[PDB]
Amino acid sequence: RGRIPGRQWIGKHRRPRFVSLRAKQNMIRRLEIEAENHYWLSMPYMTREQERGHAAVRRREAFEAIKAAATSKFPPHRFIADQLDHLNVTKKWS
């Protein structure tokens, strides 16, 4: 008997969706996990001013390796062995 207007999810007069208990428990546990993450992310170690350049050497070496791998692009080698053994298509009982 009760008819819903155009689309029960968008528009003005829409069918309202409510909350039960599973959603509340999920929100509670997610908020607890996020509060635990906030607590564990509330303590540094080097206090910023003690890391002006401790692992920059590894980054520079990795960048040099990536550059050497990207600048070493060349077509593969071409040998005569393939062109010679391709003649074995018409091989008989030899």
Partner: peptide, 25 residues
């Protein structure tokens, strides 16, 4: 699309409704 202030109450979003229902007095 409707404005921010209207007279027909305007039902909020699903996530906003869940947040308001889980954070009650």
């Amino acid at each position: 699309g409707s404005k921010a202030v209207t007279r027909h109450r305007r039902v909020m979003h699903f996530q906003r409704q869940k947040l308001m229902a889980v954070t009650e007095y």
